Amino acid sequence: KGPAVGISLGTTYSCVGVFQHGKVEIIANDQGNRTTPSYVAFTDTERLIGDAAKNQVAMNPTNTVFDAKRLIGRRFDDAVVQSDMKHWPFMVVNDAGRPKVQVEYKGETKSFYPEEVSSMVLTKMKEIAEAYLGKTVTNAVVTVPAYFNDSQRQATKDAGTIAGLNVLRIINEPTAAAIAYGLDKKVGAERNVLIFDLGGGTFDVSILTIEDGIFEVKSTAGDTHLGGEDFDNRMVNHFIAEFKRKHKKDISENKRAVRRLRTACERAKRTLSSSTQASIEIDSLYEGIDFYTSITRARFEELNADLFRGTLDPVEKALRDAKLDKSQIHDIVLVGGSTRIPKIQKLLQDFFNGKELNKSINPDEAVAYGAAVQAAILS
Ligand SMILES: Nc1ncnc2c1ncn2[C@@H]1O[C@H](COP(=O)(O)OP(=O)(O)OP(=O)(O)O)[C@@H](O)[C@H]1O
Numbered sequence: 400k401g402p403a404v405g406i407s408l409g410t411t412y413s414c415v416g417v418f419q420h421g422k423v424e425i426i427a428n429d430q431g432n433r434t435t436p437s438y439v440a441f442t443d444t445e446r447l448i449g450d451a452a453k454n455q456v457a458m459n460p461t462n463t464v465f466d467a468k469r470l471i472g473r474r475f476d477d478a479v480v481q482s483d484m485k486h487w488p489f490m491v492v493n494d495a496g497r498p499k500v501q502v503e504y505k506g507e508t509k510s511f512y513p514e515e516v517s518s519m520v521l522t523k524m525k526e527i528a529e530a531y532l533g534k535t536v537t538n539a540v541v542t543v544p545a546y547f548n549d550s551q552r553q554a555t556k557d558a559g560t561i562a563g564l565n566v567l568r569i570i571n572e573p574t575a576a577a578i579a580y581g582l583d584k585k586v587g588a589e590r591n592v593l594i595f596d597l598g599g600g601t602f603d604v605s606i607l608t609i610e611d612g613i614f615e616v617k618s619t620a621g622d623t624h625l626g627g628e629d630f631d632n633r634m635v636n637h638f639i640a641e642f643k644r645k646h647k648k649d650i651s652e653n654k655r656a657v658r659r660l661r662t663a664c665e666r667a668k669r670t671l672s673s674s675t676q677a678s679i680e681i682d683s684l685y686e687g688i689d690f691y692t693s694i695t696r697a698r699f700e701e702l703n704a705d706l707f708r709g710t711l712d713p714v715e716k717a718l719r720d721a722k723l724d725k726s727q728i729h730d731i732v733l734v735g736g737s738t739r740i741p742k743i744q745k746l747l748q749d750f751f752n753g754k755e756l757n758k759s760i761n762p763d764e765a766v767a768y769g770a771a772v773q774a775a776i777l778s
């Protein structure tokens with residue numbers, strides 16, 4: 400037949416994995432990345448998806464779509480939608496109560512339902528899998544946050560159908576993470592697991608109680624507007640200030656300068672999770688001025704201190720609601736690309752009085768990993 404795949408669809412990135420010969424392989428895309436941006440772009444001549452889309456965002460703000468996960472399954476009159484709209488550089492219109500994204504493709508203006516944008520990303524993932532597997536992918540298990548209602552889940556299932564994917568099942572992201580680590584095996588005991596998920600733009604904390612294979616979400620908390628992007632922003636402002644100090648030039652207005660500076664920062668941030676310092680080299684940032692500088696892990700940590708620290712409040716809240724003390728949680732798994740940050744790992748352990756963190760599986764691949772296993776058994 401055909402190997403069912405596991406797909407995680409995140410607000411900023413997506414990932415696809417497959418279970419074969421007892422091992423789960425996370426499939427790398429055309430650029431060789433193990434995760435693909437959830438970006439879709441429309442130009443005069445083409446429809447760009449993934450890395451190709453994100454790589455040209457500075458040029459096409461109005462026709463480059465993202466955050467479709469924040470729209471999916473919702474209405475236009477939805478307070479959330481009404482708030483989010485204020486920050487997207489693309490158009491969201493009302494179509495009989497449902498929101499739609501309006502872009503210009505090949506001179507003509509077009510509109511898409513949130514699920515159609517997601518189906519585009521889903522198609523890229525399916526494509527990546529097939530290119531690797533050398534076979535056509537039909538069956539799949541897609542992940543969704545635990546707090547998604549039936550409409551949001553419906554729309555995700557739909558986005559899968561559009562892409563020609565037979566969605567075997569939609570499972571929660573935290574549950575997929577648990578399965579990745581094997582925290583679902585029956586041990587004739589009640590296990591309390593805390594899933595700490597800090598991705599690109601969202602922060603989710605979920606306390607699961609696993610009784611004989613059966614998962615039970617006891618509490619959830621977090622911030623839908625706190626993620627790795629907020630950390631990048633802090634770097635940007637910092638460097639803008641420095642440029643204005645060394646050159647007496649404010650580049651805030653120049654959207655190209657800022658958007659290129661941001662890309663440089665996000666990159667330096669990743670290397671800061673291994674090295675203690677990274678350099679920023681950008682040619683002709685503003686006018687013909689080349690911006691050559693660098694940051695240390697120490698400085699980076701200072702810039703996001705309050706943010707990193709504030710991460711513990713949602714954790715305290717989740718425990719409180721679940722009616723558990725720090726000592727009652729058996730396993731803590733790290734999920735989301737942002738958890739690779741050292742200071743975040745330290746901060747969490749200290750809170751759990753030195754308890755060991757589960758983090759051998761790349762945190763941004765954990766959900767995909769778990770869905771792959773789940774997909775495997777489902778076939
Ligand atoms: N080494 C690293 N250090 C810090 N952040 C990293 C590292 N590697 C990846 N990231 C960050 O992880 C984020 C992507 O996380 P992930 O791939 O889990 O996102 P996601 O599921 O789309 O997230 P969400 O749904 O929360 O937005 C980006 O902010 C990226 O900068």
Ligand SMILES: [Mg+2]
Nearest residue numbers: 409598735766
């Ligand atoms: Mg994620």
